[PDB]
Design an enzyme around this catalytic site. Structure first.
Site, PDB file in Angstrom:
ATOM      1  N   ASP A 182      -2.829 -13.855   4.004  1.00 55.92           N
ATOM      2  CA  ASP A 182      -3.725 -14.951   3.858  1.00 55.92           C
ATOM      3  C   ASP A 182      -2.554 -16.092   4.060  1.00 55.92           C
ATOM      4  O   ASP A 182      -1.620 -15.935   3.620  1.00 55.92           O
ATOM      5  CB  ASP A 182      -4.383 -15.054   2.418  1.00 55.92           C
ATOM      6  CG  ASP A 182      -5.499 -15.939   2.199  1.00 55.92           C
ATOM      7  OD1 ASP A 182      -6.400 -15.532   3.005  1.00 55.92           O
ATOM      8  OD2 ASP A 182      -5.276 -16.888   1.467  1.00 55.92           O
ATOM      9  N   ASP A 196      -3.829 -13.238  -2.156  1.00 53.31           N
ATOM     10  CA  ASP A 196      -3.691 -13.960  -3.466  1.00 53.31           C
ATOM     11  C   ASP A 196      -4.858 -14.481  -4.046  1.00 53.31           C
ATOM     12  O   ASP A 196      -5.010 -14.931  -5.451  1.00 53.31           O
ATOM     13  CB  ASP A 196      -2.706 -15.321  -3.474  1.00 53.31           C
ATOM     14  CG  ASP A 196      -3.269 -16.473  -2.932  1.00 53.31           C
ATOM     15  OD1 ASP A 196      -4.151 -16.399  -2.132  1.00 53.31           O
ATOM     16  OD2 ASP A 196      -3.351 -17.509  -3.661  1.00 53.31           O
ATOM     17  N   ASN A 228      13.539  30.435  -0.981  1.00 55.66           N
ATOM     18  CA  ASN A 228      13.102  29.234  -0.561  1.00 55.66           C
ATOM     19  C   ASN A 228      12.838  28.204  -1.665  1.00 55.66           C
ATOM     20  O   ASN A 228      12.421  27.014  -1.496  1.00 55.66           O
ATOM     21  CB  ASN A 228      11.700  29.505  -0.061  1.00 55.66           C
ATOM     22  CG  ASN A 228      11.634  29.702   1.565  1.00 55.66           C
ATOM     23  OD1 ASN A 228      12.671  29.708   2.187  1.00 55.66           O
ATOM     24  ND2 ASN A 228      10.269  30.046   2.040  1.00 55.66           N
TER      25      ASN A 228
END
Ligand SMILES: CCCCCCCCCCCCCCCCCC(=O)OC[C@H](COP(=O)([O-])OCC(O)COP(=O)([O-])OC[C@@H](COC(=O)CCCCCCCCCCCCCCCCC)OC(=O)CCCCCCCCCCCCCCCCC)OC(=O)CCCCCCCCCCCCCCCCC
Ligand SMILES: CCCCCCCCCCCCCCCCCC(=O)OC[C@H](COP(=O)([O-])OCC(O)COP(=O)([O-])OC[C@@H](COC(=O)CCCCCCCCCCCCCCCCC)OC(=O)CCCCCCCCCCCCCCCCC)OC(=O)CCCCCCCCCCCCCCCCC
Ligand SMILES: [Mg+2]
Ligand SMILES: [Mg+2]
Lengths: 882, 882
Positions: free
Chosen positions: B333, B610, B703
């Site tokens: 913006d 904002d 693993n």
């Protein structure tokens, strides 16, 4: 099976016509039995029977790779004339390999001269024409009346009808130079061995004196001497080496004919035209076969023969020393080979069993003043007198005292030699004594006075039993005894008679043995150390060959006689012979049969001998040796004829021969594994590569230039452990080894593929699949792949040899690659690493970028260590590397 | 649909009586439109929606272990109880993955309280029922006559019918808190964007000054505020991270769906024991899934978020930093975010374009003496005059030298404010000075004199022409312009009145604008350096945004408007969005529309905002970034919140979000490769080994204990050449690094399959195929083969990461690994003590011999070289070994 069993029918009557042989009966005899002739021949077409072997997988490659040129001919010109860099190389390789297989056998053919002897003629015979005359040999037939005279030679076996103190030296068939008496009387009905058949004569025996009449009953193949003459022909059986090499070549062929059609089908069905598939299969046919293998085999054999030619031993056939190395059982003649056919005193003791100095000194006198007739036993006495270390000159001075009055020499009619000599003791002419020695028979008949317990007594029955027991202990070893006796008498005014020579005081007994050569025991022990069994094949009596070999250390157990093996069938003959020992009373055919059956059981049998009877056994063995004293015909039939007399050099062969085979069984595996791996990667990657990885000519270059280092492989160090067992030519172990260690290279030959297809080649010539397939850098890309795989494969296949040659832990433990081999390897890598010259018209030079070599060393090192792992696995799996 | 073009039917009238509205009217409105409500909702089923992903293979694995337990227990009793040893660990791992996947997703879900906030009602409405009252927006009707005062809340989208200088604060939709005039006159039918919708208002706006009467046009979700409330929900769109992780999980699933049914079939056709084949397939499935992959992913995200939380930047969702790293386009913006929403002087200027300090001084006194009313404009003049480098205290002295006579404050009729001051130099009562400032148009009409070049001339049309040309020149540049006129006034008898504001003398004009944050240009440059494009989606006019796009530095061309982008289709919007940098006059619909379209075009898009109008795009983007000055709704609806309003930290976050990604993908490529390799070999061995090489529990331990060091991989040293381009999640890229550098570990796994088959045969266990299927052998031999390619498979996959970690850099140009991930890695390899422990009897796992380690070292050294070669082949074929 016409035997001479007409006993008491052929004696006192000729059993046939007396020289009046009817023409019809002559024809019937020559039809049913034939004449006395010996047939021999030679050959000069050895090329035909020596080319075919390992040449065929070369002429097949020639035919395929020239049909390739024909296929690209008639259509194209440059591709159809750029092939001969193939055909020419393959053809000269065919010629070289064939010539080498020829020379490996040419020495035996051109060094065999067993024909010069025999074909004897001019026989002194009684004929109806003019009585005693010289007649050609073809005029004596079965039933003919033949006479043996002073100096004439017997041309055919005879049924002797008249004899008069006839002695014949039968060293030609029995190997014994000592004459044996031959008589006309009929022998025992059950008879004995052929050599002891006194009633029948033997061809090839020499007569010095005396005359005898006989009738020929046997000729042709029934003659034993006719037999050994007919058996010694060009029946040279394929030895162990030839069969081993053939089996290795057949392993390679069995691999080639399984791999080639598979890659042909893959590359024909998968992507390419069948011309590309044919080229691809030709590549795998060329790569698999090591082209210079016959050259390396020949150079290994030549190195062995040259090394053994300095120990002072003619090697006749070049292929004899590998057979010596692979020898498993050594069959050896006894008479003259390990013994020395020299009579020497070994037992000469009193009637209590201890050496008597007085009796041997008396014998020394009777033999050293023996001026009448010299006889081999007399030489034995005199030589033993000096070997006794008791000094002669006193006895030599005793000529002035123990003066030789006279001598009746060793007359054979009474088998008595009597020296009549006076004992001038302290200057006075005392009584005269005569000492007579001779055969035990007459002495035992005439002796009634015996020197026992220090005095002279009558020969009582108990003393007779004692003397007979000593005679038996001397005879049981097969040793003849000659009795010596002295008699005292007043000064003989008259001559001495036979009847006066009785009641004479006997001293003791004599034993003139033929001692084994001083190195025989050590040679036998060394042969046993290297895993070589020793067997004895002799025609002598069983007793003497128990005596000998009970003295050399060889285990003497149930010595097989000739009759037993004659009546024995082949299978149980092989079963007995392998698990037995010294054989006795054998004819040459018996020796040859025994050696052949030992061969058929799977044992590489060598033979040693000196006599003519041993020729058949020499020729029937894998390797026939001959000591220096061998007769000329035995020398010609030999292979490793010796010169000095010492048998110790045998081990110097048996060691060296083995270290040849190893150096030849190393390469054969060490080049069949790598050549498999190199050709494995041109199979399982023969469908992903849009072009052949390495052309035919490049692989020919790789298999040629690398095989010149294997020219130096025969000088590589075999450690110390291969040289303890006679190794068998196990080709199957080759087919396993090259299936275990060979593929370990192939994976890296794929690592070199992808690498050189993806990062190295695309670097200079752009990525593939973006180049015009016709030509531009496509030719350059293909050539760069070719030369790079050339270099990498050569490096990785000739540097792993230091890792494969020896068992675990090379370098540090077994210092490998004796300087000749390592020098040649690093001198030939420096040659193949140069496709940068004008010799880059081999359809690839493409000087490798420096970037490649770091990736080459990284491949070489890691391949060497992977081969270390697989070598450990292989050693721990079957038994060892070879 | 029903735009503000329904004139002469609804405009200039009411279509009903003024405030005389009946019940039938409201039922007509309800029938035509429906309820005037805003839809809201929530959910709590995050568990079911968040379990499914990479957890389904774990649940399938659990099911297969459960089947194995049942089968081995429905027939047997002793074996059918050791399966808990695997089922329990796998079922705890399913829950661990579920919790760790719910956590890394629900942070944003429970961090959104948008529906909780907003929701405004109770507006002042006049109704015949009870006069003036407070009626909720939930009770307002379409067509309601509404009275508007200062400070009230607008009830619905509202076409005004009566107005008197009505001013509306439109920061709720345009982001600008400065009031915009709203007029009731007959406007254009076609109208324009919301900023130019002068005839109607919008929901959520507060009236600043004036009173008005209006008619409601629509209600409910048809209002812009209602639209954005309806669009903003708990609809957190799947960011790029979830899609990438699902793609990786699906790559693993495809790999295990190709492999598992192969091993099962091979072992069910050969070695025909189907149970032992199902065990093989289960082992393959267990070893193919990286079991702790979700925990490593969570720990990487947590490390990134935690390390970014230190830079005064609170992170709300765990995935925000990773989406920031993978961000490709940042849409920001303009008002409040890039600029600071503060009017500031930038051009104090004369009438002809020269910097005249006199006009600045006159404005200084005109503002510093305006005590009757304060405004942001006057404060802007005062602050800019302090900062204009001209010494204000000297001017302050003139404040004592120019005392105030009076002032006319900013009125609501003529919109001019004036101050009358003296010129009392040294206290002397001289002539008065009247200074009036305001909008240019009015006093431009009323002016008669101008001051140029130090003299005064009449208001001729030519000079007026240049004044308007420069006025709309500044308006073209977006500066808000004010006009200032002085009058030399003789001392008046009375105070200054309206008629005293005639015959002005203009001095110049002033330029007010909101300059961008001083870090905006640097932030934009830094973002553009990192391959992050920036767009300036905003609702303000094209003039001001075009001016700002030049100051910060951006493509000023193709300032795509809002009307056209609403007019055109999504498919063309994707084409024009990537081809445009600045968007102006945007409604909150259009921001979310653009962000979503850019997301669909393949670009991961982040948004910065904002204001309230941002929330739709903030939620529709991958990551929403909120500045400090943001409204609480913007802060709550975002994913990252700054705390120092310095945009320079932003690029830092991106850097983190990239390295946090790199390690993560470096992990996924490390493990998924190795696992594949470490479970490719089994496939092959499935046809040859007489038994399973590793059971399920051994592979689970491998693993798990190896993925407890990949908890330390996120701290390793990431390169500095990887972080200069936003990397996209690629599944195929991890499926081609797994087929390429994965099967290079199978080569060294079939080796330790064979070495371990012939290096522990002599471990008192005897050769295989000799052991009875009993115990102390077939039980120990198998255990030792497990403690083989367990210990070996833990060493060869945990020490080969240092070689694969980086792109082509061997071990020194990258300082391979950080101390954390090498120290932990070796400290987990030092867990080669499990076999030698009481917990070495999880069946199998028996004590290794010392002999094994010399071979283990050789294998782990051999494998790194092959990995280096395949790394070079992989980098030089695809382009990035990541
Ligand atoms: C891992 C293998 C496990 C060991 C095994 O199966 O037995 C050992 C097996 C032979 O064991 P054996 O005790 O001699 O058994 C007798 C054979 O059954 C008797 O079979 P054979 O030795 O006569 O097999 C013949 C055949 C067998 O073909 C093969 O084995 C081809 C395998 C190529 C190896 C590269 C992979 O090989 C050929 O002659 C043609 C092969 C060329 C085509 C390529 O050895 C191998 O085959 C070695 C494989 C290489 C491992 C790397
Ligand atoms: C090492 C050999 C692996 C290299 C390879 O697969 O080629 C990649 C490489 C380029 O891959 P590509 O052209 O994008 O192939 C993608 C598929 O054709 C089509 O792309 P896609 O989107 O369908 O991807 C499917 C992908 C994913 O499929 C899977 O995940 C299947 C996994 C099966 C492996 C189980 C064993 O599997 C494949 O790439 C299909 C071939 C299966 C490989 C075996 O191909 C080569 O240049 C050949 C390398 C020659 C060396 C042999
Ligand atoms: Mg090679
Ligand atoms: Mg591994």
């Amino acid at each position: 099976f016409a035997k001479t069993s007409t006993k008491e029918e052929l004696f006192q009557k000729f059993k046939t016509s007396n020289k009046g042989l009817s023409e019809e009966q002559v024809e019937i005899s020559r039809e049913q039995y034939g004449d006395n002739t010996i047939t021999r021949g030679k050959k000069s077409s050895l090329i035909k029977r020596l080319y075919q072997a390992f040449i065929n997988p070369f002429t097949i490659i020639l035919f395929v790779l020239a049909l390739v040129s024909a296929f690209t001919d008639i259509i194209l010109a440059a591709p159809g004339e750029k092939n001969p860099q193939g055909l020419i190389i393959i053809t000269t390789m065919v010629l070289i390999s064939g010539i080498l297989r020829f020379v490996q056998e040419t020495r035996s053919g051109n060094a065999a001269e067993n024909l010069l002897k025999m074909i004897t003629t001019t026989t002194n015979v009684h004929r109806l024409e003019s009585g005693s005359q010289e007649i050609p040999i073809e005029e004596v037939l079965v039933g003919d009346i033949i006479h043996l005279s002073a100096g004439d030679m017997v041309p055919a076996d005879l049924r002797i009808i008249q004899a008069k103190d006839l002695f014949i030296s039968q060293a030609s068939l029995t190997g014994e130079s000592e004459p044996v008496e031959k008589l006309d009387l009929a022998t025992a009905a059950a008879a004995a061995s052929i050599t002891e058949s006194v009633n029948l004569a033997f061809m090839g025996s020499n007569v010095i004196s005396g005359s005898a009449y006989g009738v020929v009953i046997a000729t042709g193949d029934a003659t034993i001497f006719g037999e050994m003459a007919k058996s010694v022909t060009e029946d040279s059986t394929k030895t162990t080496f030839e069969k081993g090499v053939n089996s290795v070549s057949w392993v390679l062929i069995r691999f080639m004919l399984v791999m080639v059609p598979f890659v042909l089908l893959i590359n024909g069905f998968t992507k390419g035209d069948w011309m590309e598939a044919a080229l691809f299969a030709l590549a795998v046919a060329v790569g698999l076969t090591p082209e210079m293998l016959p050259m390396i085999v020949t150079t290994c054999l030549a190195k062995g023969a040259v090394t053994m030619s300095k120990e002072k031993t003619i090697i006749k056939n070049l292929n004899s020393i590998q057979n010596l190395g692979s020898m498993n059982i050594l069959c050896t003649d006894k008479t003259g080979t390990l013994t020395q056919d020299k009579v020497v005193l070994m037992r000469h003791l009193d009637i209590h069993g201890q050496e008597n100095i007085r009796v041997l000194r008396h014998g020394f006198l009777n033999s050293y003043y023996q001026t009448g007739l010299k006889n081999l036993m007399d030489l034995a006495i005199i030589e033993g007198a000096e070997a006794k270390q008791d000094k002669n000159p006193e006895l030599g001075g005793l000529s002035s005292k123990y003066t030789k009055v006279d001598e009746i020499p060793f007359d054979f009619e009474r088998r008595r030699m009597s020296v009549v000599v006076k004992s001038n003791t302290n200057g006075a002419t005392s009584k005269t004594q005569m000492i007579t020695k001779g055969a035990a028979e007459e002495m035992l008949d005439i002796c009634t006075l015996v020197e026992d317990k220090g005095n002279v007594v009558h020969l009582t029955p108990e003393l007779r039993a004692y003397i007979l027991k000593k005679v038996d202990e001397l005879n049981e070893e097969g040793m003849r005894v000659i009795l010596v006796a002295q008699k005292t008498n007043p000064s003989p005014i008259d001559t001495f008679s036979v009847q006066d020579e009785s009641e004479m005081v006997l001293m003791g007994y004599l034993a003139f043995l033929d001692p084994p050569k001083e190195s025989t025991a050590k040679a036998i022990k060394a042969l046993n150390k290297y895993g070589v069994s020793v067997k004895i094949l002799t025609g002598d009596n069983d007793k003497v060959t128990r005596s000998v070999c009970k003295q050399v250390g060889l285990p003497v157990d149930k010595t097989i006689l000739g009759s037993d093996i004659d009546q024995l069938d082949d299978n149980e003959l092989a079963a007995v012979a392998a698990a037995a020992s010294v054989f006795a009373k054998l004819s040459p055919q018996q020796k040859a049969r025994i050696v052949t059956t030992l061969r058929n059981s799977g044992n590489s049998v060598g033979y040693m001998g000196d006599g003519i009877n041993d020729a058949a056994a020499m020729k029937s063995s894998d390797v026939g040796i001959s000591v220096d004293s061998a007769v000329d015909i035995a020398k010609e039939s030999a292979d490793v004829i010796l010169l000095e007399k010492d048998l110790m050099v045998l081990e110097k062969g048996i060691i060296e021969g083995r270290k040849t085979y190893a150096n030849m069984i190393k390469y054969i595996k060490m080049t069949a594994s790598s050549n498999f791996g190199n050709m494995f990667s041109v199979l399982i990657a023969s469908a992903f590569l849009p072009f052949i990885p390495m052309l035919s000519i490049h692989i020919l270059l790789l298999n040629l230039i690398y095989d010149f280092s294997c020219t130096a492989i025969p000088w590589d160090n075999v450690d110390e452990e291969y040289l303890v067992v006679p190794r068998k030519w196990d080709a199957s172990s080759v087919s396993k080894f090259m299936l275990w260690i060979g593929p370990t290279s192939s994976v890296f030959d794929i690592t070199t593929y992808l690498l050189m297809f993806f990062v190295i080649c695309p670097a200079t010539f752009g990525p593939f699949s973006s180049l015009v397939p016709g030509s531009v850098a496509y030719i350059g890309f293909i050539a760069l792949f070719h030369t790079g795989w050339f270099v990498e494969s050569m490096w990785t296949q000739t540097l792993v040899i230091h890792m494969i040659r020896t068992p675990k832990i090379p370098f540090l433990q077994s210092r490998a690659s004796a300087p000749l081999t390592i020098l040649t390897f690093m001198g030939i890598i420096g040659l193949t690493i140069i496709p940068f010259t004008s010799f880059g018209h081999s359809i690839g030079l493409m000087a490798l970028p420096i970037n490649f070599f770091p990736w080459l060393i990284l491949t070489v090192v890691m391949y060497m260590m992977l081969v270390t792992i697989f070598k450990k696995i292989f050693v721990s799996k079957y038994g060892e590397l070879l």
